[PDB]
DNA sequence: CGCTGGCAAACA
DNA sequence: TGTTTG
DNA sequence: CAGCG
Protein backbone atom coordinates (compact mmCIF):
# COMPACT_ATOMS: atom_id res chain seq x y z
CA UNK A 1 0.00 0.00 0.00
CA UNK A 2 2.83 2.70 0.61
CA UNK A 3 4.94 3.48 -2.14
CA UNK A 4 8.89 3.72 -2.15
CA UNK A 5 8.45 6.66 -4.81
CA UNK A 6 8.00 10.38 -2.21
CA UNK A 7 5.58 11.74 -5.74
CA UNK A 8 3.23 8.96 -4.67
CA UNK A 9 2.79 9.60 -1.82
CA UNK A 10 1.57 12.78 0.56
CA UNK A 11 3.74 14.30 3.06
CA UNK A 12 2.66 17.09 5.57
CA UNK A 13 4.40 18.74 7.76
CA UNK A 14 3.25 16.56 10.89
CA UNK A 15 5.77 13.81 11.87
CA UNK A 16 5.17 11.04 13.96
CA UNK A 17 8.96 9.50 13.81
CA UNK A 18 11.30 12.38 14.23
CA UNK A 19 13.27 10.34 16.75
CA UNK A 20 13.30 7.93 14.24
CA UNK A 21 13.86 10.32 11.00
CA UNK A 22 16.45 12.44 12.94
CA UNK A 23 19.38 9.17 13.23
CA UNK A 24 18.49 8.11 9.85
CA UNK A 25 19.25 12.31 8.71
CA UNK A 26 22.83 11.49 10.61
CA UNK A 27 23.12 8.51 9.02
CA UNK A 28 22.74 9.40 5.73
CA UNK A 29 24.89 12.68 6.56
CA UNK A 30 27.87 10.37 7.69
CA UNK A 31 27.44 8.33 4.13
CA UNK A 32 27.52 11.47 2.41
CA UNK A 33 30.83 12.66 4.23
CA UNK A 34 32.25 8.81 3.75
CA UNK A 35 31.21 9.12 0.16
CA UNK A 36 29.24 5.67 -0.01
CA UNK A 37 26.30 7.33 -2.64
CA UNK A 38 23.77 4.60 -1.79
CA UNK A 39 23.62 3.65 1.41
CA UNK A 40 23.32 7.87 1.79
CA UNK A 41 20.27 7.92 -0.66
CA UNK A 42 18.88 4.27 1.38
CA UNK A 43 19.06 6.13 4.58
CA UNK A 44 17.28 9.38 2.76
CA UNK A 45 14.68 7.21 1.01
CA UNK A 46 13.62 5.68 4.35
CA UNK A 47 13.87 8.61 6.46
CA UNK A 48 11.04 10.48 4.13
CA UNK A 49 9.03 7.27 4.16
CA UNK A 50 8.71 7.46 7.74
CA UNK A 51 7.94 11.37 7.54
CA UNK A 52 5.01 10.35 5.32
CA UNK A 53 3.29 7.96 8.19
CA UNK A 54 -0.03 9.32 9.47
CA UNK A 55 1.43 7.61 12.49
CA UNK A 56 4.41 6.66 14.77
CA UNK A 57 6.01 3.74 14.79
CA UNK A 58 5.94 1.70 18.48
CA UNK A 59 6.73 -1.46 17.39
CA UNK A 60 8.84 -3.58 14.83
CA UNK A 61 4.99 -4.84 13.61
CA UNK A 62 4.76 -0.93 12.44
CA UNK A 63 7.82 -1.27 9.85
CA UNK A 64 5.80 -4.66 7.67
CA UNK A 65 4.90 -3.75 4.49
CA UNK A 66 7.06 -0.25 4.42
CA UNK A 67 9.24 0.45 1.40
CA UNK A 68 12.97 1.47 1.69
CA UNK A 69 13.09 -0.05 5.42
CA UNK A 70 15.28 -3.17 4.54
CA UNK A 71 17.92 -5.10 6.86
CA UNK A 72 20.22 -2.70 8.17
CA UNK A 73 17.46 0.60 8.77
CA UNK A 74 15.06 -2.17 10.99
CA UNK A 75 17.74 -2.50 13.25
CA UNK A 76 18.51 1.26 13.25
CA UNK A 77 14.43 1.73 14.19
CA UNK A 78 14.84 -1.46 16.47
CA UNK A 79 17.46 0.69 18.74
CA UNK A 80 15.49 3.52 19.03
CA UNK A 81 12.04 1.41 19.95
CA UNK A 82 13.94 -1.02 23.02
CA UNK A 83 16.74 2.27 23.98
CA UNK A 84 14.72 5.51 22.82
CA UNK A 85 17.97 6.65 21.74
CA UNK A 86 20.14 5.66 18.57
CA UNK A 87 23.80 4.54 19.54
CA UNK A 88 25.26 4.19 15.51
CA UNK A 89 23.30 8.21 15.34
CA UNK A 90 25.20 9.33 18.53
CA UNK A 91 28.62 7.75 17.80
CA UNK A 92 28.26 10.02 14.77
CA UNK A 93 27.62 12.92 16.34
CA UNK A 94 30.99 12.57 18.29
CA UNK A 95 32.89 11.81 15.47
CA UNK A 96 35.44 14.93 14.44
CA UNK A 97 35.40 14.70 10.52
CA UNK A 98 31.73 15.02 10.73
CA UNK A 99 31.52 17.71 13.41
CA UNK A 100 33.96 19.72 11.21
CA UNK A 101 31.95 18.46 7.98
CA UNK A 102 29.05 20.17 9.88
CA UNK A 103 30.58 23.09 10.56
CA UNK A 104 32.75 23.64 7.01
CA UNK A 105 29.63 23.33 5.43
CA UNK A 106 27.19 25.45 7.10
CA UNK A 107 29.34 28.65 4.89
CA UNK A 108 27.36 28.87 1.93
CA UNK A 109 30.00 27.97 -1.22
CA UNK A 110 31.27 25.22 1.12
CA UNK A 111 30.51 21.26 0.33
CA UNK A 112 31.89 17.70 0.77
CA UNK A 113 35.28 18.51 -0.96
CA UNK A 114 36.57 21.78 0.36
CA UNK A 115 35.39 20.67 4.34
CA UNK A 116 37.40 17.50 3.86
CA UNK A 117 40.15 19.47 2.21
CA UNK A 118 40.27 22.13 5.48
CA UNK A 119 39.90 18.65 7.42
CA UNK A 120 43.02 16.76 5.79
CA UNK A 121 44.66 20.45 6.06
CA UNK A 122 44.52 20.47 9.82
CA UNK A 123 41.44 22.59 10.42
CA UNK A 124 39.18 22.37 13.17
CA UNK A 125 37.95 26.07 13.65
CA UNK A 126 35.94 28.41 10.95
CA UNK A 127 37.88 31.63 12.18
CA UNK A 128 41.43 29.60 11.51
CA UNK A 129 40.28 29.51 8.20
CA UNK A 130 39.23 32.78 7.58
CA UNK A 131 42.52 34.02 9.45
CA UNK A 132 44.96 32.28 6.21
CA UNK A 133 47.37 33.94 4.09
CA UNK A 134 47.30 30.81 1.68
CA UNK A 135 43.72 29.81 0.93
CA UNK A 136 42.08 30.95 -2.11
CA UNK A 137 38.02 31.34 -1.60
CA UNK A 138 35.67 31.24 -4.50
CA UNK A 139 33.32 34.65 -4.85
CA UNK A 140 30.79 32.13 -2.98
CA UNK A 141 33.03 31.68 -0.15
CA UNK A 142 33.76 35.30 0.11
CA UNK A 143 29.51 36.00 0.63
CA UNK A 144 29.59 32.84 3.00
CA UNK A 145 32.26 34.35 5.41
CA UNK A 146 31.04 37.92 4.75
CA UNK A 147 27.08 37.52 5.86
CA UNK A 148 27.99 34.35 7.93
CA UNK A 149 25.31 35.25 10.74
CA UNK A 150 22.82 36.21 9.31
CA UNK A 151 23.01 33.36 6.43
CA UNK A 152 22.70 30.51 9.05
CA UNK A 153 19.72 31.84 10.92
CA UNK A 154 16.75 30.59 8.89
CA UNK A 155 14.07 33.07 7.09
CA UNK A 156 11.26 32.87 9.01
CA UNK A 157 7.50 33.91 7.45
CA UNK A 158 7.31 37.81 8.28
CA UNK A 159 10.74 37.85 6.43
CA UNK A 160 9.76 35.76 3.52
CA UNK A 161 6.83 37.75 3.18
CA UNK A 162 9.17 41.14 3.20
CA UNK A 163 10.90 39.75 0.23
CA UNK A 164 7.97 39.03 -1.50
CA UNK A 165 6.78 42.85 -1.64
CA UNK A 166 10.73 43.38 -2.49
CA UNK A 167 10.25 41.35 -5.65
CA UNK A 168 6.55 42.21 -6.76
CA UNK A 169 7.74 45.75 -5.98
CA UNK A 170 10.87 45.71 -8.41
CA UNK A 171 9.33 43.16 -11.06
CA UNK A 172 5.89 45.56 -11.36
CA UNK A 173 8.26 48.15 -12.25
CA UNK A 174 9.18 46.33 -15.60
CA UNK A 175 6.42 44.28 -16.22
CA UNK A 176 3.42 45.26 -14.21
CA UNK A 177 1.56 42.36 -16.19
CA UNK A 178 3.92 39.47 -14.21
CA UNK A 179 2.48 36.80 -11.84
CA UNK A 180 5.18 36.35 -8.93
CA UNK A 181 4.58 32.99 -7.11
CA UNK A 182 6.78 32.14 -3.79
CA UNK A 183 8.08 28.56 -4.58
CA UNK A 184 9.99 26.16 -2.29
CA UNK A 185 9.97 25.44 1.28
CA UNK A 186 7.45 28.35 2.24
CA UNK A 187 5.01 26.94 -0.67
CA UNK A 188 4.84 23.75 1.01
CA UNK A 189 3.24 25.64 4.06
CA UNK A 190 6.78 25.93 6.13
CA UNK A 191 7.08 28.44 8.76
CA UNK A 192 10.62 28.39 8.25
CA UNK A 193 13.44 27.98 5.38
CA UNK A 194 17.31 28.44 4.50
CA UNK A 195 16.05 30.68 1.36
CA UNK A 196 13.06 32.02 -0.54
CA UNK A 197 12.20 30.78 -3.71
CA UNK A 198 9.92 32.42 -6.47
CA UNK A 199 9.02 32.12 -9.85
CA UNK A 200 8.00 34.89 -12.10
CA UNK A 201 5.86 34.73 -15.20
CA UNK A 202 3.92 37.13 -17.83
CA UNK A 203 1.46 36.13 -20.47
CA UNK A 204 1.72 39.15 -22.22
CA UNK A 205 5.26 40.65 -22.62
CA UNK A 206 11.02 41.48 -23.27
CA UNK A 207 10.45 38.87 -20.61
CA UNK A 208 14.36 37.85 -21.92
CA UNK A 209 16.05 40.04 -19.47
CA UNK A 210 13.51 40.90 -16.61
CA UNK A 211 15.50 38.73 -14.23
CA UNK A 212 18.60 41.41 -15.07
CA UNK A 213 16.32 44.62 -14.97
CA UNK A 214 15.40 43.70 -11.49
CA UNK A 215 18.63 42.66 -9.76
CA UNK A 216 20.37 45.76 -11.51
CA UNK A 217 17.14 48.11 -9.89
CA UNK A 218 18.17 46.54 -6.68
CA UNK A 219 22.52 46.80 -7.47
CA UNK A 220 21.43 50.76 -8.15
CA UNK A 221 19.66 50.77 -4.05
CA UNK A 222 22.79 48.79 -2.60
CA UNK A 223 21.04 45.62 -1.98
CA UNK A 224 22.68 43.70 -4.15
CA UNK A 225 24.97 42.09 -1.93
CA UNK A 226 25.69 38.86 -4.25
CA UNK A 227 24.28 37.41 -6.98
CA UNK A 228 24.96 34.65 -10.03
CA UNK A 229 22.82 34.78 -13.04
CA UNK A 230 21.19 32.13 -15.16
CA UNK A 231 20.04 32.01 -18.92
CA UNK A 232 19.03 29.30 -21.60
CA UNK A 233 17.43 28.49 -25.08
CA UNK A 234 4.51 20.73 -28.96
CA UNK A 235 6.82 21.91 -26.28
CA UNK A 236 10.26 23.30 -28.45
CA UNK A 237 13.06 24.93 -26.64
CA UNK A 238 13.85 26.91 -23.89
CA UNK A 239 13.48 31.12 -23.00
CA UNK A 240 14.45 30.61 -19.44
CA UNK A 241 16.33 32.40 -16.94
CA UNK A 242 17.36 32.53 -13.08
CA UNK A 243 18.86 34.60 -10.65
CA UNK A 244 20.65 33.55 -7.19
CA UNK A 245 20.89 36.91 -4.98
CA UNK A 246 21.85 37.60 -1.50
CA UNK A 247 19.76 40.78 -0.53
CA UNK A 248 20.03 43.34 1.94
CA UNK A 249 16.73 43.11 3.90
CA UNK A 250 15.67 46.17 6.13
CA UNK A 251 14.23 45.40 9.61
CA UNK A 252 11.63 48.64 9.11
CA UNK A 253 10.34 45.93 5.76
CA UNK A 254 9.48 43.46 8.36
CA UNK A 255 6.88 43.46 10.80
CA UNK A 256 19.90 44.44 20.23
CA UNK A 257 18.71 45.73 16.64
CA UNK A 258 22.52 46.93 15.92
CA UNK A 259 23.06 46.87 12.01
CA UNK A 260 19.72 47.58 10.62
CA UNK A 261 19.20 44.53 7.93
CA UNK A 262 19.80 41.15 7.42
CA UNK A 263 21.21 39.32 4.13
CA UNK A 264 19.05 36.86 3.22
CA UNK A 265 19.22 34.09 0.00
CA UNK A 266 16.64 34.45 -3.08
CA UNK A 267 16.30 32.15 -5.69
CA UNK A 268 14.14 33.85 -8.74
CA UNK A 269 13.12 31.67 -11.92
CA UNK A 270 11.69 33.21 -14.61
CA UNK A 271 9.88 31.11 -17.15
CA UNK A 272 7.16 31.80 -20.32
CA UNK A 273 3.80 31.31 -18.66
CA UNK A 274 3.02 28.04 -21.33
CA UNK A 275 5.77 26.09 -19.57
CA UNK A 276 4.42 27.63 -15.55
CA UNK A 277 2.94 24.05 -14.42
CA UNK A 278 6.22 22.79 -15.05
CA UNK A 279 8.36 25.24 -13.37
CA UNK A 280 5.54 25.28 -9.97
CA UNK A 281 6.36 21.40 -10.36
CA UNK A 282 10.27 21.63 -10.28
CA UNK A 283 10.91 24.34 -7.76
CA UNK A 284 7.77 23.67 -5.27
CA UNK A 285 9.92 20.20 -4.23
CA UNK A 286 10.94 19.01 -2.13
CA UNK A 287 14.17 17.80 -3.33
CA UNK A 288 13.07 14.11 -2.54
CA UNK A 289 9.91 14.88 -4.10
CA UNK A 290 11.67 15.73 -7.27
CA UNK A 291 14.20 13.02 -7.41
CA UNK A 292 11.22 10.42 -7.19
CA UNK A 293 9.07 12.46 -9.54
CA UNK A 294 12.00 12.06 -12.40
CA UNK A 295 12.87 8.17 -10.72
CA UNK A 296 8.83 7.46 -11.19
CA UNK A 297 8.11 8.79 -14.45
CA UNK A 298 11.44 6.97 -16.47
CA UNK A 299 10.96 3.63 -14.65
CA UNK A 300 7.27 3.18 -14.72
CA UNK A 301 5.98 5.48 -17.12
CA UNK A 302 8.59 5.13 -19.83
CA UNK A 303 8.43 9.32 -19.67
CA UNK A 304 11.31 11.63 -18.99
CA UNK A 305 10.28 14.98 -16.47
CA UNK A 306 12.19 17.99 -16.22
CA UNK A 307 11.30 21.34 -14.87
CA UNK A 308 10.22 22.26 -18.36
CA UNK A 309 8.41 19.64 -19.55
CA UNK A 310 7.45 15.89 -19.44
CA UNK A 311 8.10 13.80 -23.03
CA UNK A 312 6.60 10.20 -23.38
CA UNK A 313 9.15 8.39 -25.08
CA UNK A 314 6.71 5.77 -26.41
CA UNK A 315 4.97 8.25 -28.24
CA UNK A 316 7.64 10.82 -29.00
CA UNK A 317 5.62 13.63 -28.20
CA UNK A 318 5.36 16.53 -25.66
CA UNK A 319 2.48 16.15 -22.99
CA UNK A 320 1.11 19.97 -22.15
CA UNK A 321 -0.34 21.15 -18.91
CA UNK A 322 -1.84 24.17 -18.00
CA UNK A 323 -1.53 23.11 -14.04
CA UNK A 324 0.20 20.85 -11.78
CA UNK A 325 -2.78 18.68 -11.61
CA UNK A 326 -2.35 17.99 -14.89
CA UNK A 327 1.42 17.18 -14.82
CA UNK A 328 0.20 14.46 -12.02
CA UNK A 329 -2.96 13.30 -14.42
CA UNK A 330 0.05 12.55 -17.37
CA UNK A 331 1.78 10.82 -14.87
CA UNK A 332 -0.79 8.30 -14.21
CA UNK A 333 -0.35 9.84 -10.16
CA UNK A 334 -3.04 11.13 -7.54
CA UNK A 335 -2.56 15.05 -7.43
CA UNK A 336 -0.67 15.95 -4.23
CA UNK A 337 -1.17 19.27 -2.91
CA UNK A 338 1.86 21.49 -2.12
CA UNK A 339 1.67 21.29 1.81
CA UNK A 340 1.77 17.18 0.74
CA UNK A 341 5.32 17.71 -0.88
CA UNK A 342 7.48 17.48 2.30
CA UNK A 343 9.23 14.51 1.54
C1' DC B 1 23.90 -11.33 -8.27
C1' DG B 2 24.83 -6.97 -10.51
C1' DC B 3 23.21 -2.53 -11.60
C1' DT B 4 20.70 1.88 -10.34
C1' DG B 5 19.99 5.47 -7.39
C1' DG B 6 17.42 13.03 -10.21
C1' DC B 7 18.64 16.87 -12.11
C1' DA B 8 20.78 21.59 -14.15
C1' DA B 9 24.07 25.41 -14.47
C1' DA B 10 27.75 28.78 -12.81
C1' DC B 11 32.33 29.42 -11.24
C1' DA B 12 37.52 28.38 -10.82
C1' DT C 1 35.86 20.32 -15.19
C1' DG C 2 35.32 19.38 -10.68
C1' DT C 3 32.72 21.54 -7.09
C1' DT C 4 28.75 23.63 -5.24
C1' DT C 5 24.61 25.65 -5.60
C1' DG C 6 19.35 25.53 -6.34
C1' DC D 1 21.58 0.42 1.77
C1' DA D 2 17.31 -1.14 -0.78
C1' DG D 3 14.60 -2.60 -4.93
C1' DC D 4 14.23 -4.53 -9.38
C1' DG D 5 14.82 -7.51 -13.27
N1 LIG E 1 18.89 19.49 -4.64
C1 LIG E 1 17.87 20.27 -5.03
C2 LIG E 1 17.60 21.50 -4.36
C3 LIG E 1 16.52 22.20 -4.75
N2 LIG E 1 15.68 21.73 -5.74
C4 LIG E 1 14.37 22.40 -6.06
C5 LIG E 1 13.20 21.96 -5.17
C6 LIG E 1 13.17 23.05 -4.12
O1 LIG E 1 11.91 23.20 -3.46
C7 LIG E 1 13.55 24.28 -4.92
C8 LIG E 1 14.18 25.37 -4.10
O2 LIG E 1 15.36 24.83 -3.45
P1 LIG E 1 15.83 25.14 -1.98
O3 LIG E 1 17.29 24.96 -1.90
O4 LIG E 1 15.48 26.64 -1.69
C9 LIG E 1 15.07 24.22 -0.90
P2 LIG E 1 13.71 24.08 -0.07
O5 LIG E 1 13.97 23.23 1.15
O6 LIG E 1 12.66 23.54 -0.94
O7 LIG E 1 13.44 25.52 0.54
P3 LIG E 1 13.86 26.15 1.94
O8 LIG E 1 14.38 25.17 2.93
O9 LIG E 1 12.58 26.89 2.43
O10 LIG E 1 14.90 27.18 1.55
O11 LIG E 1 14.51 23.80 -5.88
C10 LIG E 1 15.97 20.53 -6.40
O12 LIG E 1 15.16 20.09 -7.22
N3 LIG E 1 17.09 19.83 -6.04
MG1 LIG F 1 13.96 27.61 -0.26
NA1 LIG G 1 27.71 25.00 2.43
Known sequence: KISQYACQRRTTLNNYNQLFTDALDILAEND?????????????????????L???????????????????????????????????????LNDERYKSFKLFTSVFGVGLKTAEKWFRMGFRTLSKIQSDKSLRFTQMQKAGFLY?????????????????????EAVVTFLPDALVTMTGGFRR???????????????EAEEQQLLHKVTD???QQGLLLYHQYHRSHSSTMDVFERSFCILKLDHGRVHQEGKGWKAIRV???????????????????????????????????????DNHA???????????????????????????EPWERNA
Open 310 to 336: LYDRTKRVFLEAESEEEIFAHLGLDYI
Open 148 to 168: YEDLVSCVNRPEAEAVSMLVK
Open 217 to 219: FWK
Open 189 to 203: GKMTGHDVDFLITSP
Open 32 to 52: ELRENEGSCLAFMRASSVLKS
Open 54 to 92: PFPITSMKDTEGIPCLGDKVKSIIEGIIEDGESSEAKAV
Open 267 to 305: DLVMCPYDRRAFALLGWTGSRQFERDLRRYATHERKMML
